[PDB]
Amino acid sequence: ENVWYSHPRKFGKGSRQCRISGSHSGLIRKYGLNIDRQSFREKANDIGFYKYR
Amino acid sequence: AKHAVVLDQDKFDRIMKEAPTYRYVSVSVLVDRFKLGGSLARVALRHLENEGIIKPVSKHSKQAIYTRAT
Amino acid sequence: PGVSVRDVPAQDFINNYASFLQRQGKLEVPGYVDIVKTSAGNELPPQDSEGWFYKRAASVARHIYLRKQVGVGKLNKLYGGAKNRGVRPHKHVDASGSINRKVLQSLEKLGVVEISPKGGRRISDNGLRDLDRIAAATLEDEE
Amino acid sequence: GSFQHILRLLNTNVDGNINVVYALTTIRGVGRRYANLVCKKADVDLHKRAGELTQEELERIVQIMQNPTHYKIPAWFLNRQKDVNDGKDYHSLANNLESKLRDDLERLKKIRSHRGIRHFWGLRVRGQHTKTTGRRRA
């Protein structure tokens, strides 16, 4: 409704986000995952990652 | 500066006097007498390789050993 | 016999090639000679001053002979080396582009380099003659 | 031999013996790569000691030191450029340069800016962290 209600958020840390909740810190963007490093340890083997060595 | 680097014509007389008949001839040897210090000794040694006089052994930059021509 | 470039040592090859060019003086000069740093990171200019370019142009020609097709950006990366970027670790960045480009532009008109397909610069027929003649001349110097 | 040791050039000292460039670096303005650029115009050997020179070479060099755009320089190997309103460039290489910087520093103090305020107290200007650097001050 109001005119000014945004910023150029097409880059940096504020615009980027995870899939689960939306944390702006500790973000894995490798291979287009977008799941933060706390939840990645929980969901490693379901995706297919394993601790071989 | 500890002297013996400035170019003098009086010294150039005594370089040719003390050139022949020596075991050790190099950049390491001539600077011990307080002759042309550092690089000007290399230029002084470069004169003595042209017209015989003193013949070489090693041919490296920083390791330039020579010996008298028997 | 088997007269090739590889029998002559690579460092000794350029010495005979440099003197060959300075007799003629027909390899051409760009204009940036001795107003030059040489690379993107290099405190002192060229110590050789006179000659200099003829050493550079010879070493570019022999590398174009061995390989299929060499370019400008790769030659800058090959000649270029280390830096001293303040109080940090030493990095690697390309050398001067304007020097190595005008080597390739001038050698085309003299009669060495040729325009190849896809991308890069290969060798002419008359370019292989002058490479072998100086290689044969260097073979006579050794033997 | 031993022709002259100091040997002045625009009031500043130019010590005898040594070299072309590294004796000229004594001038408050000339450096380790400018004197080579100046020596290139006159065409003199860097191999020589340079304090023992011909008389014409000193006067030929000083003309190149004063005038930048006349002699063969690209006009981007200069110390200072652009001063006053809308126009030209110029530099200096003697006691002129040290005096020029003090007058040019007063311009920053007169306009009174973030640099000029910092220059009054003797603190770090270029956005450094002053929680460590230089435990002495001046």
Add this chain to the structure above:
Amino acid sequence: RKRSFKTYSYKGVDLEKLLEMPTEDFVKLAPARVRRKFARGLSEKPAGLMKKLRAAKLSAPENEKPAVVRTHLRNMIIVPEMIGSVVGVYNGKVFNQVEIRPEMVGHYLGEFSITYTPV
């Protein structure tokens, strides 16, 4: 009589021309930062502010200072159209006054106030 002090300006000849050379002519005679900034699109940067600065000199009481044009936009460079008016620079604690001059040219509004209280 002619020269009082000296010309207060950028790099070269004389002052007089600066008063009647809006922005585009001023940008030509400037360093790398002002040229690159003004080359890009300035929308609501000199739009809202300049209408007050020009209108203040109409409303001024002849010879004395015009009214203070307060500024959140302290990223603006001092172009020579408004040499004479005062501007209020926002640190946080009140809009602080800055008197613009032809000496103060080619500089930002923020640097004539400073936001930390010691020195």
Add this chain to the structure above:
RNA sequence: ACGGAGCCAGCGAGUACAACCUUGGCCGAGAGGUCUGGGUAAUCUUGUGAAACUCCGUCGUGCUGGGGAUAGAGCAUUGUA
């Protein structure tokens, strides 16, 4: 240390709904401008011919050409800034 000359690795990574890695060619003393591609990747960047090193020259034991901090002016680029 400062010059040329010689010239060799392995782990990786990488856009099509975005703006990724980007050779080859021109402009430039640099940084970087631009025309073009190729690559969804033992296919194109890429042989990621990376450094330290090798070998002839320039300096030689002097806060020195070692060392690079503080400083000033401008030329570039990423960005609403």
